[PDB]
Write a protein that binds this DNA or RNA. Structure first.
Ligand SMILES: Nc1ncnc2c1ncn2[C@@H]1O[C@H](COP(=O)(O)OP(=O)(O)OP(=O)(O)O)[C@@H](O)[C@H]1O
Length: 367
RNA sequence: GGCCAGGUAGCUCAGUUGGUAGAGCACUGGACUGAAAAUCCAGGUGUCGGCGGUUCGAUUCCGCCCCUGGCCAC
């Protein structure tokens, strides 16, 4: 219906950005980005009116947001910078060639993909390529983004883009960049399933040393990341109904050797979840003694008492130890699963004494 | 859209090793009164946001959503 309203208004609208990429990658998303030559606001208002839904105009930015069903629509006016601006000027201000393309929703040319910079070629060649040599200088945040994309799509940086990125990092532009944008970029990074690869790229180009103060790479941490990779794989395989956010675990492994002050500060900047902060504060201190207690474990009930109050993340961190692995697993798929019939429990009930008695019965069943 | 709080009676507010809930003023009834108020005895003062899951048992553990306020990414 967009092309029709655009025809009535005598305008030109286009699907633009990653939305196109995902479309070309076969990935269907509910968030669509539009670039409109002429006023996008009235277009969004009319489209919202015909479908009979609310509209959220933003005149100063020149963009408008409206929601139809599960579809989240954003209409943006064509702008050459971050006289009417052409679509090409609006695309050339973007980061990478794969994100620089567009698909015309105009009724006459409808279905046609508009690619000026050959982003389609780079898409088929699995290449992350910047539009201009000053790209990383303009927006240092992109230094992360590229890597992030290279993590997700499993693409490779072109020689040009790679050299330019390395030069950009060597100038320490990553420190001059706004803290919030970088932190948010890392937040977007850790949400990826391929995030580990993004960490490999972060290690390769050493951006984490720039962003995080006091952070240095070693082998133990990396091996811990791959072990955690295996644990995450298994847990997301069998226990998948119990899934939690995995990236934060890797993030904890990275900051494990860091000082508690810098760790708490970083987690504060990242706006980490409560269970993440708890797992970190537990890891930095009580984790060692916990392991030492798990080493002295003989009966299964002691293992129960030491494990059950803990979260799943802590257990996954306990699976990093080879000796504790099968123990944790045994606690998972067997130990904590059990029940009791009616008459028996009725005999058990005859305050806290009922609970203590139940515990005595459980440790009576286990051992 | 991300996060942090806040959600407790009509209103204003505390509450952690899960184990049988609270304050200050409105609410009902009776004693009291010509009527009313005060006051006394008392006692509602509540599925402690909503829906699932774990647990013998969840205001608490978790997950998904509702509401309000504040930091922002926009
Ligand atoms: N710092 C930047 N510089 C230039 N162009 C950018 C920048 N950030 C975003 N863009 C462009 O604007 C679009 C905004 O899309 P969005 O913010 O959703 O990111 P994305 O690439 O779609 O990934 P995701 O959907 O995971 O956020 C992107 O497709 C990108 O082409």
């Amino acid at each position: 219906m967009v092309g029709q309203i655009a025809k009535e208004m005598g305008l030109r609208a286009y699907i633009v950005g990653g939305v196109v990429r995902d479309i070309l990658l076969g990935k269907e998303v509910w968030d669509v980005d539009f670039v409109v030559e002429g006023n996008a606001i009235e277009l969004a208002k009319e489209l919202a009116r015909r479908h009979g839904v609310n509209v959220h105009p933003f005149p100063e930015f020149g963009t408008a947001h409206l929601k139809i069903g599960k579809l989240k629509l954003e209409f943006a006016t064509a702008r050459r910078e971050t006289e009417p601006a052409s679509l090409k000027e609006d695309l050339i201000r973007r980061d990478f060639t794969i994100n620089a393309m567009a698909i015309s929703v105009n009724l006459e040319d409808y279905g046609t993909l508009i690619d000026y910079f050959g982003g389609l070629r780079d898409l088929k060649d699995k290449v992350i390529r910047v539009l201009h040599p000053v790209s990383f200088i303009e927006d240092p945040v992109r230094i992360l983004r590229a890597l992030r994309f290279a993590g997700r799509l499993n693409f490779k940086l072109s020689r040009s883009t790679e050299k330019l990125l390395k030069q950009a990092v060597n100038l320490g532009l990553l420190k001059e960049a706004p803290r919030g944008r970088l932190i948010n970029e890392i937040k977007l990074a850790l949400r990826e399933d391929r995030f580990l690869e993004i960490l490999e790229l972060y290690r390769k180009y050493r951006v984490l040393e720039e962003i995080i103060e006091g952070f240095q790479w070693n082998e133990k941490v990396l091996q811990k990341l791959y072990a955690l990779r295996k644990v995450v794989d298994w847990h997301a395989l069998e226990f998948s109904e119990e899934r939690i956010d995995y990236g934060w675990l890797y993030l904890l492994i990275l900051i494990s050797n860091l000082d508690y002050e810098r760790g708490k500060h970083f987690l504060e900047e990242m706006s980490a979840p409560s269970w993440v902060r708890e797992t970190y504060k537990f890891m930095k201190f009580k984790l060692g003694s916990l392991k030492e207690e798990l080493k002295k474990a003989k009966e299964n009930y002691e293992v129960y008492r030491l494990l059950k109050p803990l979260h799943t993340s802590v257990l996954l961190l306990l699976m990093l130890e080879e000796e504790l692995k099968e123990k944790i697993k045994l606690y998972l798929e067997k130990l904590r699963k059990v029940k009791l019939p009616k008459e028996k429990i009725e005999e058990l009930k005859k305050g806290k004494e009922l609970g203590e008695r139940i515990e005595e019965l459980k440790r009576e069943i286990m051992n």
